[PDB]
Amino acid sequence: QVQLVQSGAEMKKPGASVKVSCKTSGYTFTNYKINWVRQAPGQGLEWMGWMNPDTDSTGYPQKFQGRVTMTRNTSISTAYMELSSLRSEDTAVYYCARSYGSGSYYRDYYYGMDVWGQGTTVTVSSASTKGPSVFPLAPCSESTAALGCLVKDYFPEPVTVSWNSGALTSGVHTFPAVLQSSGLYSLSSVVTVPSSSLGTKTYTCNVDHKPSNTKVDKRVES
Amino acid sequence: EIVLTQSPATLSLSPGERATLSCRASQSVSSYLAWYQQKPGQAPRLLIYDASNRATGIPARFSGSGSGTDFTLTISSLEPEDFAVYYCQQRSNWPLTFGGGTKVEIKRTVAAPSVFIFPPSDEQLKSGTASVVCLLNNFYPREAKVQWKVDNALQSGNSQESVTEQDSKDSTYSLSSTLTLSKADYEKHKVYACEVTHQGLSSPVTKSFNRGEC
Amino acid sequence: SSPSEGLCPPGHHISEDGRDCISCKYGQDYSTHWNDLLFCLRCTRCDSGEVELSPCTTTRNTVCQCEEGTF
Ligand SMILES: [Cl-]
């Protein structure tokens, strides 16, 4: 049971800093490097630097010097990454990952970034938390029809969308949110059904948005 | 910095088919190249370290080879769980860098989208904003073009779209596009049209409605 | 010693923060050019059918050649 357990999701304003923690267990903390790696939405992995928990030595890509600080607390086996002067562009999942080999052992005794934390989501925005407005998607009006809900203007991610309290799952598509220029997200969730069932069966989307404590049901009328 | 180029960016292959992924370094990194796998919403997972050494827990169908500048990740036969994004990573030069990734997706027969258009709700209209939604349902391949038209005027810069991950049952994609206008601008016009172009359609498909007659 | 425009001299490699240059170990590993390598490369040893023409130095890998039967 080698594990890396990271701190929870965070929201930050532009200009602030964020400190993510990475708690290790199941091995000697001091014997492996910790690496930090980030991934902005729909983007690739970007290495942020690394730390030798034994000597407290660090190194960061030039693009991140000043902004990134890697520290550790050995007595509790946890490493930290602090990122300052946050921008929109810093919105990402942040991962810690160990790797073996430092100093004179680095070339010959390295076995990859073998265990990773679960990741910490950091959203950088000046928006404040807001639950969605939920609007019906219906045609004025094929053998099959589409129905949906537009889940508009919310912050932050995520939103959960249910249909008929979970009873309906076939032909459901809940799309990735888009970030609008307002700074709020918007998503749609659709379902195709036998258009014969439109007279005799009701269709309700259940929209859960935990960060705002909002839970909304919308009956979609054809 | 060492630049790691993974080309092609997307590989379309069938389950039970061989996959060969390419990673090329801007200059020789000898054997100091690792391979990682990442599924959507999961942490990356180490596959191969130092070019050709399979990591613990990784099934024997994965193998890496190459040295210097040209490296290959081979998946001898694709399993459903192998469709994912793959990244190479060099460790010989300061600072460590990743490649831009290669997505391996499921090849299946061409499937044309089912297209639907939705008017803004009376509910939303009360608020002063109108959203018009165009749905492209269950298509393959992923490449599709949606173009908005308002009174036959081609739209630009006032819409956004997103695409689902490839469907686990039928391997298709779906796309949602949202045209946003102010209520004032919306009520200025009659015909709202969504035109879609896709390999599965011999001609583009247009779905539309007339405002207020809806 | 300090890197020059991000680079360390032949026969050296760069440190783990990109701030320092460290000498290769003579006869063990090498570095041929101004570099940002995190370690020196291990010297090649000749295989039995080959003679050593010049030894590995911190700036130059071993040069090996077949004996009287090239190549
Ligand atoms: Cl990188």
Author numbering:
A (entry chain H): 1 to 141, 146 to 226
B (entry chain L): 1 to 214
C (entry chain A): 74 to 144
The authors write:
TRAIL activates two distinct receptors, TRAIL-R1 (DR4)5 and TRAIL-R2 (DR5)678, both of which possess a death domain (DD) in their cytoplasmic tail that can interact with the apoptotic machinery. The assembly and trimerization of TRAIL-R1 and TRAIL-R2 are prerequisites for transducing an apoptosis signal. We generated a novel anti-TRAIL-R2 monoclonal antibody, KMTR2, which acts as a direct agonist possessing the ability to induce apoptosis without cross-linking. KMTR2 can oligomerize soluble TRAIL-R2 fused with the Fc region of IgG (ecTRAIL-R2:Fc) and clusters membrane TRAIL-R2 on cell surfaces without cross-linking, inducing the death of human tumor cells in vitro and established tumors in vivo.
The tertiary structure of ecTRAIL-R2 in complex with KMTR2-Fab was determined to 2.1 Å resolution by X-ray crystallography. Although the electron densities of the N-terminal (Ala54–Arg73) and C-terminal (Arg145–Lys181) regions in ecTRAIL-R2 were unclear, the final model included two cysteine-rich domains (CRD1: Ser74–Ser96 and CRD2: Cys97–Gln138), and some part of CRD3 (Cys139–Phe144) of TRAIL-R2 and the heavy (Gln1–Ser226, excluding Arg142–Ser145) and light (Glu1–Cys214) chains of KMTR2-Fab. This model also included one N-linked sugar chain bound at Asn73 of the KMTR2 heavy chain and five glycerol molecules, one chloride ion, and 276 water molecules. KMTR2-Fab recognized CRD1 and CRD2 of TRAIL-R2 in the direction perpendicular to TRAIL-R2. The area of the contact region between TRAIL-R2 and KMTR2-Fab was calculated to be 623 Å2, with contributions of 322 Å2 from the heavy chain and 301 Å2 from the light chain of KMTR2. KMTR2-Fab recognized two epitopes (epitope-1 and -2) in ecTRAIL-R2. Epitope-1 included Ile87, Glu89, Asp90, and Gly91 in CRD1, which was mostly recognized by CDR1–3 of the heavy chain. Epitope-2 comprised Asp102 and some residues in a “50s loop” (Thr105–Arg115) in CRD2, one of the two natural ligand recognition sites, and interacted with CDR1 and CDR3 of the light chain and CDR3 of the heavy chain. Two KMTR2-Fab molecules interacted with CDR2 of the light chain via two-fold crystallographic symmetry, and consequently, two TRAIL-R2 molecules were situated in parallel within a C-terminal distance of 20 Å. The contact region mainly consisted of the region from Tyr49 to Arg61 located in CDR2 of the light chain, including six direct hydrogen bonding interactions and four van der Waals interactions, which may have partly accounted for the strong interaction between two KMTR2-Fab fragments.
